[PDB]
Structure 1
Amino acid sequence: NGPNEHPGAKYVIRDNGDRIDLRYHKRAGDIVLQYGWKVERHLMDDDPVLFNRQPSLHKMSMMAHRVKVMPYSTFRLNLSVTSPYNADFDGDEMNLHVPQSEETRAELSQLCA
């Protein structure tokens, strides 16, 4: 699908650590994936992500949500979680952090959910 079509991927990482960029590859269809390689796929549904608002006064200001991809350019929250974040929709902004490992994903889904 490539790096412009959702769902897609951005890079393919070999065992030795070399990165294959899928934007500048003319033979993307001529790539066979071996076990143990890594594919830097796009963010998809039900991916745990850490979500945060400043100032972080207490530990409920950082909680892990499940991703749902939607149109338009704003983060969207169920309104019950606007209390722990001390957030309202008059212009506030919030930070999203993506875990990059299986261990970190498990920690987010089992501790900060």
Structure 2
Amino acid sequence: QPSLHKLSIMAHLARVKPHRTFRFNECVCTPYNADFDGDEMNLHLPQTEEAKAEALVL
């Protein structure tokens, strides 16, 4: 949520899994400055094919 540089928001390819938490690889903790101590991270699902493609490429 506190978005300092432009890598505070990136696009991942989602995969569904049973438990109730967003689970990303820990090598990506340095761009978000996440720390896994109860931190929350927002999700945004684009609704248009142009938005998917611009998210995936850029």
Q: Which residue is 1:93 aligned to?
A: 40
Query: What's the counterpart of residue 59 of structure 1?
Result: 6
- Counterpart of 2:18 in structure 1: which amino acid? P
What is the total number of aligned residue pairs between the two structures?
58
- Structure 1 unaligned spans of 5+: 1-53
- CA RMSD of superposed structures (Å): 0.5
The structure richer in strand per residue is: 1
TM-score by length of 1: 0.50
Q: Could you state the TM-score of these two structures normalised by the residue count of structure 2?
A: 0.96
Q: CA deviation at 1:88?
A: 1.2
Name segments (4+ residues, structure 1) moved above 6 Å.
Answer: none
Report % sequence identity: 66
Q: Return the index of the structure with the highest Cα Rg.
A: 1
